[PDB]
Point group: C3
C-alpha cells in the first residue's frame, strides 16, 4: 500500500552519527533501521564498577537515527534469544500506541517491525517501556537513545536564515542507580533480574550513583575526546530519558539552542547553560572560536566531576588573543599591594 | 464602590473544570468563588497508605478557577471549626499582600473575603501559606490548586490565529513526604499536628515518598481515565506548587505549550516533554490523532511508574495506519539472520 | 597593542551593584576589576552554624561585575598567602581556555591578570574551577558570582521598546553541603582542607543542607530587606552556579524575564515563577504596584522556608484597593451557613 522508495540506514555507535543530508531535495522515503537489544554487564566508571545494562545495539545511549520530515521510519526491533527479558520501543517522535510501545513488545527470540511517520521535527528520545515498574528499570538500565527529524530544508535560525553544521555529535546522558552493600561498596550480580530488587530500592530514592555520557565515566575524555577545528559549526544533540540535565560547554556557549529540542521553534541565542528536561532531547549549535580543550558538562558540577558527567572536546587551530589573553602570568603579589 | 455585575461560580472537583466561556463579549464582572478548607486523612496510594491531608474543597488539587482578564475575583475562604489549624490563601495571579496571604489568615470557625483583579493572563498556582515553616507544610499536605485567567478573545497561537479547546482537564501534581518507621513502613497519625514533626524531617531531605496526580496513585487510571475523541483539541493544565515536573503525553505531543503558563507569551510547538517549574502552572493543547490508551506522566519515569505519577487518557475513534502501523507482528527471528 | 581607554571599577558587596550606565554612548573600554580570594569560616544559618567558606572578595556570592557589549574585561585575581588552596576563575561570559580557568590558576601568594572580550550579552556566572573534584568543592564552598554584559543601548523588550530599571539587586543563591555527626548536629572544622572529605560525602548525595541567598539564611530579611518604592522598575539578577532554582516574587510577578539570562533573546512576560538552570544567571524586571512586604523565594517552599532561601523586599507607597482588597475581614462563619 505505501509505495515510496526504501532506504536502509546503517547505524553507528554514539557519539558519532550515521551519514545523512541536512537539506535534501529527495522526497519522502521509507527509512529502514534495525535495533538489536543486548543485555550485558558493562563497566560504568573509572574504578571498574559494573552493572547489568540493557541496551539498543550494545551502546549507551542507543544510536542516533536521522530522518527528514515526512519520511516514514520502519524499525525492525530484534530481541535475541540470549536475552532474558521482554523489550519494546517507544518513539517520542511518533504518534499513537504509546509511541510504538504497545505494538513492539517482543520476548527473547522474537522480532517486530514498526513503521511511524516523521510528522514532527526536532530531536526526540526513544526508549524501552515494557509496562509498569519495568518502564523506568529498562530505561535507567540503558535502554534509551534519540532520533532527529530534520526539516527538508535543514536547520534555520527562526529568522529566515539557514544554519548548517560541519559536525554533529550525540551525547546521551544516563543516570544510573547502582546498589551498595552496608559498607558502601557497589554490588555485582549475575543477571539483570538478580539486580532488580536492590536496584529498584536505589531508584526509589531518586539519587543516581553515576551520571555518565556515552555509557561510562570518562567515556568522552582522554583519547576519546570529541574533535573539532576553529571555525566549525558543531551540533551537539543531548538526550536524557529519565532525569533533567543542564548542559554547558566550558569556554564556549550555545550559539543557537533548542533546549526543548523542536525545530518548529526558533532557537535561543548565546546561552551559557541550557536545560534538557528528563524525557527529552535538545540540541545546541556552536561555532568554535578558540583552540584547546573544552569540557562539556552537566552544570551540576558535583555530577560533572564526581559522578561521571564530563566530556571533552579537543579543538585545533590558532588562539585569538583579542577574545581572551593572559595579560600577566602568575606572579608573586607585589609587596607594595595593600 | 466597585459597580460591576456579580456572577457566582460553582466549582467542580478536579480533573474536571467548571463551565466557562473561552472567548467572551461580556465585560468585566466580579466573579464570586467559595473555598472551604478541609483537613482530613486521605488515601494516597494503591496499597492504602494514608496521610493527614489539608485541602481546599476536599480535593487534591484544589479546584480550577476560571476567569477572564480584567475580571475581579472575589473569594470567600472558609475555615470550619472542625479544622485544627489556621489557613490562608496566596494567589500567584494576584498583585499585593503576598498574593492575598497577608489578608486571609483565618482560624477555625472563621471566614474571610478577598478580592483581586485578574490583570495577568495564564494559569497560576494558588496555595495556603500561613507563615514560616507552615508554608511548605500546608502546601505539601495538599493545600494548592490553580486559577486560569483567559484573554477575553480566548487563546491564540502567538501568530494571530485563534486556538479553541474542545475539552479541558486540570492535572494537579502533588509531592508527598510520608514518614516511615525503622523498618520502612509508612506511619499513621491521628491529626496533622501529630504528623508534623516526622513529616518535616522527610521534607528536609527533599525526596518525596509519593508523586501523585489528583491526590493519589492511580487516581486517573482505570475507570477514572480521562476521555477524549480523535480530532478533539484538549487543553491539559498542569500545576505543581512546590517541586518541578516534566509532563509528557505518551503517544502524543504538546501541539501548543505554554510551559511557563502565561498566555501573553507565544506557545512552543510540537514538544515531546515540557517543564512545570515548582511554584507554577503550565498548559498544553493537543489534538488527538489516534485512538487508544495514552499515559500522561511526569517523565521522571521512576516517579511516574513507582511513586504514583501516571494518568491515562482513553481516546475513542479510528486508527490511522499512515501515522503508525505494525508492519509485522512479533515473530521468531529468522534462522537465516546473522 | 590594545589601545582603548582604561576604567577602574570598584566593586561593591552583594546584593548591591557598583555604579554603571544602562545605555551608553561611550565606546569600548578596558574595564579593570580586582577579585581577591578569601577563605574564611562563615556563619550560614540563623542557629549559628558555620562552615569553611571560600569566596571572591569575602562575600557569597562574589560581587556583580557590570560592563557593556564590546568592552574588554581585565581582571586581576589575587590569592593571598593567608589562603591554603590554589584558585582560579572561569567566566561563563568569556570565550576560550575553559572560560579563563586554564589561564588563572594561582597558588597562595600569587596573582594573575586575565582579559576577556565581552562579546555576549546577558547575565553570566563566574566561578572558581581548579580541576577535577576541586571544581564542585570550590563552587559549593562559595566561590561563584556573576557578571552582566549590557547592550550599549541598555535593555529592551524584544519588540523595539527600551526597558530601564530604577534599581538593581543581585541575588546569589548558594547550595551548601554541611557535614553532620551521627546525631545530626552540624560538624565544624579548623580549615577547608580538614572539612573536605566529610563535605564531599554530603555533596555526593546531591541534597543540600542549606540553600541561601547572600551567603546565609535570613541575610536579606529583617533589617537587610531590599528597599523599593511603588512605581519603580527593579531588575533582580539571580544566579546559581551548581544547582537549579525557581525564583518567585510573592505578591508580584516577573514583568519581563530572561530566565536563561541572555539579552539577545526577547524576555517572557508576566511570569509567576521562573527557572535558573544550575550553572547560569537569569534576570527579571518588575515594576512594583503595591506597597508592603514581599518575599522573594525559590519556589521549592521547603528550601525557601526550611533551608534558608527567602529574601524580603520592603516597598513604600500607597495601597491600591482596585488591584486587591480585603472585602470582609476575618469573621465568625455565619450560623446560617450550610
Ligand atoms: O574487589 C572489588 C573491586 O574489584 C573491582 C575491579 O575493577 O570491581 C569488582 O567489584 C565491583 C564492585 O562490586 C564490581 O562492580 C565489578 O564487577 C567487579 O569486577 C573494583 O571496582 C572493586 O572495588
Ligand atoms: O506540526 C507538525 C505536524 O503536526 C500535525 C499533526 O500530525 O499538526 C499538528 O500541529 C499543527 C500545527 O501546529 C496543528 O494545526 C494541528 O492541528 C496538529 O494536529 C501535522 O498536520 C503537522 O504538519
Ligand atoms: O560512598 C560510601 C563509601 O563507600 C566506599 C567503600 O566502602 O566507596 C564506595 O563509594 C565511593 C563513592 O561512590 C566509590 O568511589 C567507590 O567505587 C565505592 O566502593 C567508601 O570509600 C565510601 O566512603
Ligand atoms: O590550543 C591551546 C594550546 O595552544 C598553546 C600553544 O601551543 O597556547 C595557546 O593557547 C593559550 C590559551 O590556552 C594561549 O594563552 C596562548 O597564548 C596560545 O599560544 C598551548 O599552550 C595551549 O595548550
Ligand atoms: O497494617 C498496616 C497495613 O494496613 C494498611 C491497609 O490498607 O494501611 C494501614 O497502615 C498504613 C501504614 O501505617 C496507614 O497508612 C493506613 O492508615 C492504615 O490503614 C496498609 O497500607 C498497611 O501496610
Ligand atoms: O501585563 C498585564 C498587565 O500588567 C500590568 C500591571 O498590572 O502592566 C505590567 O506589564 C506591562 C506590560 O508588560 C508593563 O508595561 C507595566 O509597566 C507592568 O506594570 C498592566 O498594566 C497590564 O495590562
Ligand atoms: O521502602 C523501604 C522498605 O519498607 C517496606 C516495609 O518494610 O515497604 C514500604 O516501602 C515500600 C516502598 O515505598 C512501599 O511499597 C510499602 O507500602 C511500604 O510499607 C519494605 O517492603 C521496603 O523494603
Ligand atoms: O484504539 C486502539 C484499539 O483499537 C484496536 C481495534 O479495536 O486496534 C487498532 O489500534 C491498533 C493500535 O493500538 C492498531 O495496530 C490496529 O490496526 C487498530 O485496528 C485494538 O486492538 C486497540 O486496543
Ligand atoms: O555547641 C554547638 C552549638 O553552638 C553553636 C553556637 O552558635 O555553634 C557551634 O557549633 C556549630 C555546629 O558544630 C558550629 O557550626 C559552630 O561553628 C559552633 O560555633 C550552635 O550552632 C551549635 O548547635
Ligand atoms: O552573538 C554575539 C557575538 O557572538 C559572535 C562570536 O563572538 O558570533 C556568534 O554568534 C553569531 C550570531 O548568532 C553567529 O553568527 C556567529 O557565527 C557566532 O560566532 C559575534 O560575532 C557576535 O557579535
Ligand atoms: O536533622 C537531624 C537531627 O539533628 C538535630 C541535632 O541532633 O538537628 C540538626 O539538624 C537540624 C535540621 O537541619 C538543624 O536545625 C540543627 O541546627 C541541627 O543541629 C536534631 O534536632 C535533628 O532531629
Ligand atoms: O504597605 C502595607 C501596609 O500598609 C497598611 C497601612 O499602613 O495597610 C495597607 O496595606 C494593606 C494590605 O497589606 C491594605 O489591606 C490596607 O487597606 C492598606 O491601608 C498596613 O496595614 C500594611 O502593613
Ligand atoms: O556487575 N554487575 O552486576
Ligand atoms: O518485562 N520486562 O522486564
Ligand atoms: O564553566 N564551567 O563549569
Ligand atoms: O494516616 N495518616 O496519618
Ligand atoms: O499555622 N499553621 O499551621
Ligand atoms: O514515552 N513515555 O515514557
Ligand atoms: O565551622 N566550620 O568548619
Ligand atoms: O586545588 N584546589 O583545592
Ligand atoms: O506565593 N508564594 O509562595
Ligand atoms: Cu527493555
Ligand atoms: Cu517516554
Ligand atoms: Cu493551610
Ligand atoms: Cu507561592
Ligand atoms: Cu577556589
Ligand atoms: Cu561553569
Amino acid at each position: 500500500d505505501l509505495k515510496l522508495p526504501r532506504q536502509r540506514v546503517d547505524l553507528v555507535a554514539p557519539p558519532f552519527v550515521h551519514v545523512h543530508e541536512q537539506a535534501t531535495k529527495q522526497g519522502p522515503k521509507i527509512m529502514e533501521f534495525k535495533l538489536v537489544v543486548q543485555e550485558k554487564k558493562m563497566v560504568i566508571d573509572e574504578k571498574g564498577t559494573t552493572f547489568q545494562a540493557m541496551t539498543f545495539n550494545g551502546s549507551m545511549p542507543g544510536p542516533l537515527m536521522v530522518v527528514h520530515e515526512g519520511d516514514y521510519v520502519e524499525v525492525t526491533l530484534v530481541n535475541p534469544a540470549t536475552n532474558t527479558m521482554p523489550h519494546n520501543i517507544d518513539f517520542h517522535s511518533a504518534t499513537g500506541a504509546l509511541g510504538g510501545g504497545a505494538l513492539t513488545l517482543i520476548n527473547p527470540g522474537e522480532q517486530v517491525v514498526l513503521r511511524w511517520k516523521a510528522t514532527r521535527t526536532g530531536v526526540f528520545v526513544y526508549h524501552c517501556a515494557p509496562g509498569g515498574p519495568m518502564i523506568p528499570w529498562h530505561v535507567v538500565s540503558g535502554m534509551n537513545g534519540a532520533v532527529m527529524v530534520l526539516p527538508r530544508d535543514g536547520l534555520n535560525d527562526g529568522h529566515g536564515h539557514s544554519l548548517r553544521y560541519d559536525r554533529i555529535y550525540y551525547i546521551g546522558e544516563q543516570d544510573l542507580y547502582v546498589p551498595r552493600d552496608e559498607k558502601g561498596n557497589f554490588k555485582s550480580y549475575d543477571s539483570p533480574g538478580e539486580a532488580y530488587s536492590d536496584t529498584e530500592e536505589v531508584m526509589r530514592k531518586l539519587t543516581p550513583t553515576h551520571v555518565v555520557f556515552n555509557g561510562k565515566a570518562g567515556a568522552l575524555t582522554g583519547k576519546n575526546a570529541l574533535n573539532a577545528n576553529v571555525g566549525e559549526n558543531v551540533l551537539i544533540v543531548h538526550s536524557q530519558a529519565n532525569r533533567d540535565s543542564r548542559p554547558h560547554l566550558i569556554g564556549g556557549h550555545g550559539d543557537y539552542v533548542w533546549e526543548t529540542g523542536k525545530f518548529s521553534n526558533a532557537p535561543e541565542t548565546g546561552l551559557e547553560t541550557w536545560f534538557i528536561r528528563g524525557g527529552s532531547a535538545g540540541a545546541a549549535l556552536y561555532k568554535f572560536l578558540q583552540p584547546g580543550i573544552y569540557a562539556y558538562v552537566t552544570h551540576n558540577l558535583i555530577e560533572a566531576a564526581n559522578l561521571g558527567a564530563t566530556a571533552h572536546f579537543k579543538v585545533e587551530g590558532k588562539w585569538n588573543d583579542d577574545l581572551m589573553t593572559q595579560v600577566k602570568a602568575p606572579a608573586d603579589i607585589p609587596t607594595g599591594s595593600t
